[PDB]
């Protein structure tokens, strides 16, 4: 989530005064090239480096990745509601997240570098196979970066992290 280790250099700048989504690239600043769903969306030649996705009320989404002097970073699955990506389902106040990779192993879920879906003492957070369910989702509290990894594997080894910001 917070760390860029694992080629997760694409991060969302959560310091916006307005309801705009800004994407940040964690690379050696020479020239920043931003990509969206595999297609290049801009080329920042010095000066500015953050990628503006527009107002969050427009529900920005997609697999966003950047590239400086090195190769492109891992995709950032953006999902706002005001390579196989993580599937997001919203039904009333319940948010369902489906792990893109479900090889049948013990799949673990983490929310902003915090394990979730393991203990049964949470009625509003249940894990069923590769599906993570969040009942009574809190827009301010349940939003952030999400990633799923099998037991024994590092979350940083996930192919892409899911950035969710949904108002329910």
């Amino acid at each position, epitope marked *: 989530m917070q760390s860029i280790k694992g080629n997760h250099l694409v991060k969302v700048y959560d310091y916006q005064e307005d309801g705009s989504v800004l994407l940040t690239c964690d690379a050696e600043a020479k020239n920043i090239t931003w990509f969206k769903d595999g297609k290049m969306i801009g080329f920042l030649t010095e000066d500015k480096k953050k990628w503006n996705l527009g107002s969050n009320a427009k529900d920005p989404r997609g697999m966003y990745q950047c590239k400086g002097s090195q190769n492109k970073s891992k995709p950032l699955q953006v999902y706002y509601r005001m390579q196989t990506p993580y599937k997001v389902s919203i039904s009333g106040t319940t948010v369902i997240l489906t792990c893109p990779q479900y090889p049948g192993s*013990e799949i673990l879920w983490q929310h902003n570098d915090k394990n979730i879906g393991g203990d049964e003492d949470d009625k509003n957070i249940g894990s069923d196979e590769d599906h993570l369910s969040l009942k009574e989702f809190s827009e301010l509290e349940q939003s952030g970066y999400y990633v799923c990894y*099998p037991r*024994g594997s*590092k979350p*940083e080894d996930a192919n892409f992290y899911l950035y969710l910001r949904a108002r329910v």
Partner: single-chain antibody
Amino acid sequence: DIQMTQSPSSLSASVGDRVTITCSASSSVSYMNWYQQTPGKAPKRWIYDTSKLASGVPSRFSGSGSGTDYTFTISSLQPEDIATYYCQQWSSNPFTFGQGTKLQITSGGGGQVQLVQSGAEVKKPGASVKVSCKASGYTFTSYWMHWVRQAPGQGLEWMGNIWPGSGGTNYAEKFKNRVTMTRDTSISTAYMELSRLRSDDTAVYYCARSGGPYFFDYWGQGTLVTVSSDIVMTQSPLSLPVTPGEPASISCRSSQNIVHNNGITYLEWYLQKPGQSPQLLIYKVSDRFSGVPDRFSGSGSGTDFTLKISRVEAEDVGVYYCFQGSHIPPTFGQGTKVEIKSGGGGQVQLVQSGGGVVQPGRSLRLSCKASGYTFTRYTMHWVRQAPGKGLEWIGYINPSRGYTNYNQKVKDRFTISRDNSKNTAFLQMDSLRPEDTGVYFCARYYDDHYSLDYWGQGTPVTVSS
């Protein structure tokens, strides 16, 4: 599945020699873990995250590697390092382990100076016992086969020297009229006979060999003579406990100034490791003997001397008797039995049960009891170690969620179940075949360390008709 190659499959090295084991992965692995598996012992993780050594691992071990290449390196080979060192990758299921690197000692004795004592003497009160120390690998007529005895509840108390070539023996004051030591230069052996064996003279009697600067260099095996019906150096600490890796310190005080008239202070700190003969660990007050790790490095001056083990590993546990021979009778201290902390707090253990001999086609149910940690917070894995083969992962079950993953070879025959109420995982093996015979050990996996840190004792199962 990612294939792991271990190089070399078997390596023989001399004591102190640098030993390197190479691990080659069929695919780029983010981290490779190293496990130390002694013969008949469960695999013990050597290094995690491919560079972080597990707790208690001596600094002589080092891990390196990235992507598809990883290496396990030993700075200085030791007899305790004899074990099967295997690399394991968890980047993709199943957690694959290498074929195993069989580490052997390439010493072969090398006719190294090795005194060998008689041993196993039990007498009656008032009798006499004669001990013999068959020297080998040295000019048995050029080194003074000094004798020394440490009775149960006492330190190193010399029993009087010899000059094995000429037979001209000095002797010990408290035994001058009872212990006569005569050599046999032809058979390359020294002999010492103690007369009128009392009750207080039951002990283990060693036969040193006073070296150049280091008295009692190569101590014999030691004979236990149990018969039943002087500059005073005392060791400051006693039973001084330290934690694994915690720095320790044992000190000793001299009754007089133990700097000899020759100007060389013949103070030394022998280190009777548990179960072995005492072995020099400081040749003089400060210098260390050849073959002692860099950790053990004492110091002192005048009448106060103190040993300071820089990092008390599992290898330093044993009574560190402190000897001072600059005075005529060679008298030592009582020595501080430096022992591990032995807290017992991390009682995390996996007890394996349910093994035995079963017929082919029958079903065997294995149980692995977990205690000392949250059973639901960690994943318990099943790994089978076939006779003569490397570690093979069978599967695992998540106690918190119930999610189970199994290797395709045994996914249709082995079932992973967990009992959170008893903190035990169940490995139901159905239709067991002769190929299923082997050692199955349950390992608790640390996701944050990306390594199975705690592994069970292993349960042998034999599929025989």
